[PDB]
């Protein structure tokens, strides 16, 4: 069997499917997944082609973070030809994948100085270091925005050639391009990967059928590790992936207008953020919340909807207040337990993984697809992706001290982003009383592993049973790798 099965119909599954089908016209490539795309991240995405917009001081302070950033900058160079190659299989009436060429990053005071001020400085530095075209511009020169004056930006950064795509039109163009290249869509879900004598045999589907294959590529988003972890030994050799549950919305604007550019803040408390992505036809996309959940969730909370709407109406455009809500969207960012993606080969011959991309899998998709296809054809793919091999000991990209500083800063940032109004002694009081319980949790979980802040807050407020299960997991991983 030289047959290829791609498990997953998100941006990563379809992107790798398209690259395999185009590159190996000799082989049969079958892509699994249903049109409902349950918990799907890609359909809930705007989406921003975020390289520089995703820069944080905390990310760029670690070697693993600087490597992830380098890959995002590399991926940006592939997008123009990738889009051309996908629109080539379609006509004008299919709609345009690209919705904006440029991004404006806004700095307002509706957040923590320790995140927003540091992150704005880090973005400016990363742009200069990469020789990317950009300009700090007068806020008065930013098109379209009409913020509440008390929520308004005082600094603005124009990033040239950092744009957005319509995630729905991208998925349609990938499916069309996949079929054009001879790929076959089988609208069922994989239940189980079959392997024996350290080699893949194929996939059992949820209609009871068995599909044989020499290659299985797992791109099932937040379900990817749970699917592979069933194979012998792999439960403690493939890092867990959780659901980074994200809420976004489509709004029909009061006057049918929209901005010419992406409008965004830097990443904010626990990897949420505020952005507006232009859409065709009098629609705008607003996003996006983030909460790491130990179990999947397919519905927005009241809190998430209110926070998203309140931020957009005050910080971007008060006209959105009177605008019509068309759709609340919910998707699961694949959130890796060690904070880095799972991309490449396994100890099982013919078994590949493309997952754990959290906030920027869609942006990195053309690079990640080409990397995995290179590896499948006996190549070395892309240089900096080696460290993010899916079969690995949990990465420790930061000291426990750095993470404990970060988790307290991010907790305080949930206050400043609201924005709260409190007596002035309360924030210092909460800072001092948060340090102890988070230090105690970190020490209790493991002697070697520390979860990143986004996951640590989820664990802090989870049931005792869920905490104990994670202590067991971390201990089993240490046993396996040490």
């Amino acid at each position: 069997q030289t047959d290829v099965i791609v498990v997953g119909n998100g941006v990563l599954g379809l992107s790798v499917g398209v690259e395999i089908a185009r590159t190996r016209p000799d082989v049969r490539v079958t892509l699994l997944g249903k049109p409902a795309r349950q918990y799907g991240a890609t359909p809930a995405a705007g989406a921003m082609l975020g390289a520089f917009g995703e820069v944080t001081a905390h990310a760029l302070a670690s070697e693993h973070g600087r490597k992830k950033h380098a890959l995002a900058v590399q991926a940006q160079r592939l997008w123009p030809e990738w889009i051309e190659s996908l629109e080539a299989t379609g006509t004008a009436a299919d709609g345009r994948i690209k919705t904006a060429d440029d991004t404006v990053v806004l700095l307002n005071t509706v957040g923590h100085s320790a995140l927003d001020d540091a992150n704005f400085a880090a973005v400016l530095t990363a742009l200069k270091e990469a020789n990317a075209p950009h300009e700090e511009i007068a806020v008065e020169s930013v098109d379209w925005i009409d913020p509440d004056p008390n929520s308004r930006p005082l600094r603005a950064l124009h990033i040239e050639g950092e744009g957005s795509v319509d995630s729905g039109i991208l998925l349609a163009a990938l499916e069309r391009s996949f079929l054009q290249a001879g790929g076959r869509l089988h609208p069922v879900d994989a239940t189980e990967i079959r392997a024996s004598h350290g080699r893949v045999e194929g996939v059992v589907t949820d209609d009871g059928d068995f599909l044989p294959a020499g290659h299985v590529v797992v791109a099932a988003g937040a379900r990817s590790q749970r699917l592979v972890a069933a194979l012998p030994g792999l439960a403690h050799r493939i890092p867990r992936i959780y659901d980074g549950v994200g809420v976004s919305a489509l709004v029909d604007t009061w006057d049918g207008s929209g901005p010419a550019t992406v409008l965004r803040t830097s990443n904010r408390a626990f990897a949420c953020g505020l952005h507006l992505v232009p859409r065709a036809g009098g629609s705008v996309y607003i996003g996006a919340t983030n909460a790491v959940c130990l179990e999947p969730r397919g519905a927005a909370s009241i809190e998430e909807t209110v926070f998203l709407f309140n931020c957009a109406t005050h910080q971007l455009h008060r006209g959105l207040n009177g605008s019509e809500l068309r759709k609340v969207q919910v998707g699961s960012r694949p959130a890796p337990i060690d904070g880095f993606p799972l991309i490449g080969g396994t100890s099982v011959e013919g078994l590949w993984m493309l997952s754990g991309t959290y906030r920027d899998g869609l942006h990195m998709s053309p690079l990640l697809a080409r990397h995995v296809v290179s590896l499948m054809d006996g190549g070395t793919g892309v240089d900096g992706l080696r460290e993010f091999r899916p079969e690995r000991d949990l990465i420790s990209a930061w000291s426990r001290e750095e993470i404990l500083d970060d988790v307290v800063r991010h907790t305080m940032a949930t206050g400043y982003q609201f924005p709260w109004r409190l007596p002035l002694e309360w924030p210092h009081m909460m800072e001092t009383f948060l340090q102890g319980p988070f230090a105690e949790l970190a020490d209790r979980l493991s002697d070697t592993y520390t979860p990143p802040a986004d996951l640590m807050t989820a664990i802090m407020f989870s049931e005792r049973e869920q905490q104990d299960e994670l202590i067991a997991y971390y201990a089993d991983v240490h046993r396996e790798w040490h």
Copy 2:
């Protein structure tokens, strides 16, 4: 008989006709989509005493409307029994709560909330209704923000709620069981000649003949009848009272045993939670009178509804899952009172303009119109709400101008805003002039109620001018 409309009023009258006249063919029009439908967006509360305001009970027309709501409450137990009788256990229960708790908090204007709470208490005592002012600590389930918490609570016995979705299903089933036929199309035009109804042209191009046409098309009811000769200025206009509500799956699957509500608030919105089966709660409900229909919630409406419920009722709703944002059009009559009964056109009847409490009044209104169709006199106090009439003037222009400014200020206090203390008095004084000027400009005789006056104040000049023309044409017709 053709019933035009598949809301609570159309189906309720359809069921009563089909059961009462087994000799006649009754056909009910309307689509399963129920576009702009009020009934599916309703909780719904069987609100009689809960709907009492000081402003309503200060007018004779308001006191008449209240009397009818108290009468309607007595019909509900046997009405529900008669609708559930046509179904089985698996169809679910129409009744979702027996009792209501009215909460008084300070997240609103004293001039509405304090006056309205006193008016509810008075109306209960006057009607000898079973009720008790209770300790807030004794209210089950609620977990408000302390700064948004109630300091007074009122338990109303036998004032409850129904599942509006299960009610609609039970009405459709009961209608079919009684020999009614559902034709899922919309009426485009009522046909009449020699002052008598001939039937209805439908939107699939067909013509259905009838000796009787009952218009219960919610907010579309007057626009449908106004096409017939003279009736444009003889049937009071009905606008869309666009309302937003939501279904929430609670964090722990719990819900309150009773309806939880405030009194009616700025421009006939209000905060309430209606129990549902299966770990769901209904939260409602916004209200904005729109001169044109709107089928989607605004961001502002969604945020206001969620913010009020999480702070004033239960902070646990914050972490609860949003299942559905619902939008419907309360039929908002331009003179503030319903359109119920016969026309100058033989066989033409209207059941509409019920705004906030058509669903509660439905069994009474259905029986009234069926009595009239059988040559009876129906219910005594419904005469004044005959659909073919001069616009009612239930309040002085002065009362309405006081009310519209109070309600405008109440939008601030309900937010709740935080302002420099001189700003509210400054806004009160600068609001009075423009609203007095608008009222004087619109007509020398008619004043729109506050809910509609705010919509007109912030409408286009062309829409204002069209209303000046309408009011002038009505005065010409009746004076």
Copy 3:
């Protein structure tokens, strides 16, 4: 002539001075203290004749609290004849001591339900138990008030015969009555009490002079214990008194109007509260903040002034916003470390103490004065003031558990009273993270003594050196008494 020296020129010193001079024509009575009245509580007081208004659920849950309450109810009965006897020594132009006969207690939502709702219920219960004349009234029937609707009361309680005095006119009338009865005012401060062979010899003054006496009555407010603690053994036998620093203000109202009654809330976080006391001549008194300080402070903080003004303008009358500020007043409530007053005799012959009355020494003054004068004349004074003898082991009126529940409730109440606006998950988060540090502090301070909540918060946020000094103090007290 067998000389008596009263050390202190507040309400308690002058009240006891007047009672001695009137009752004992045989004794020469000299009263020390300067007209500046440094750190003086009495001049900063409104003052309310608070018996029922001062009731809290927490106070009435302890035996010591119920005893203190009984004495406040007894003191109320003495005020009419006491005022008559003080005004008798003056003329019309001296002004009236009594400023109001009745009090209205208001319940609004600008505070914690766990204090304000419980305390309102406790006031209502105490009134019914005492058969005191009172009526729950419609808020619309409360005269004069014009609150912000979002800060308005929804319940109101009229207390008949619970009134107020002008503290300044009371002090003037006491000084005049003291002179009329043959008392002498010596405007210097005591530096040292002289004692040998377990008997008082007299007082060294701060002008270097020595005044001989057979009797010394210490009524020096918050300085009372520090003055007596210099005598042998008494450092660990007289409970420490700290400064309950309070800020109040005199305001000339926009229209010269004022309310006919006292307007107040129940006691709020850390024994502060909101009240308005009527004054003559188009003036109103607004009060009053409270912060226990381990060292004296004679100036208002910005925070205290803003909190007091914000509460009064929103919760009582918006007209106060445009009213003229005449005076910011600061005084030290004598705050006893064990939460109960220091009234009566010492192990030193002729040495008496009248202090540690915290919030209601002025109200209790005629009763306390008569008690101590009775004791000095060989009488038994008033029943049930025995328990508040100044030379004692620290009282433990509450379990450590009760105090730890109270300190967390009061801490949260500082938020609700502001009032803050926070994300809805934050208060529960702060409640859970406050419990641990306060339990840890309580355990560290002593194995037997627990400071009441008002003092525990001050110790929690004091320097490590001040905490260690208090650990030493508590240990030295245990050694002395066990």
Copy 4:
């Protein structure tokens, strides 16, 4: 009589007194005014030597505004030698007049974009046009400040050589320098200026005395025009001066620290502003509110104190919250009805006026003093000050349209500066409903004169009788000059 009487003991009276006494050792110069300095602006001032810091877009849009700005830049050059000459008459223990050399202007979002953003741009432009030393600096590089993150600055401007003086030390140094130069201080107030045959005879004082003089210089702050208006015809020939009532405070900082520079915002709603001026000895000055009052007021309102304290603690330093309030200061900025100063000679021989300097008389004092002394000695003084001659038709520096735009913008700015939290439709609603009543008022007051925004808001909210009296005044001025 060659005797000179200076009426007023503020910065302008004493500055002109010193210059006359030093320049004319042959003449007797007597300076009137009491040490209480009732309604005195100078003692309530920080004070900033504000030239560029005082720049607004609205001021620099008028020719009269640009002229006033040029004079402020000229005045700055005189300060170093002026201070040297005043300190020369004293000793080390008298303390230093200068308290800072530099100013940092901060831009935060606690205000209207239409004032704060425009004014920050106008300051930057005025600095570049004048070639003045300045630098836009990183906010993180601003020393000492510790703002609430939600109230923090995002832009900062360092202005070199724009500093501050201690107003109290300046007044002491001026009085001492006046005596050293042979001036005599007579601590009484002028009641009446005596003139006949178009020449000054002298001054009747409030102790009933008459002082003869050939020269009377009126520098009585906000009382200056009311004093001269009693002389024949001058009621409608000298523009009215009102009280710009200002509230400031002296604070002892928590740790005795203070900033090395002035910290300020640009001028805000109705010519108030937020600033901190360094002082010696662990004190800081915070200011300053402004409200034009048609009658004098000597006491702060609650509202003014709360606004000043809230702005300083949130926007400058949260440490000020726990800092001790030493003094609330109130003074009357002389607010000319036509918005420009009254400097120079009259139609009455020997009668001079130095007044109506509003926010920057103290800064301009050395220039203004030298101008008037030059004129008295038959010189032409300083070129651009001719236009601000005290005997004039009311200046119309702006169109009625410009003022109506300004008054509505400033009214809305009172909301954004609070800062308020409102439903997003409310500000647009208030903007539209404010325009009509202010247009109606402006049209009713006069067909030719429009009061500037600061005065127009005061007139809008004054009694009908006060409005009618102003209609009469404006009509009488038109009659006199047309």
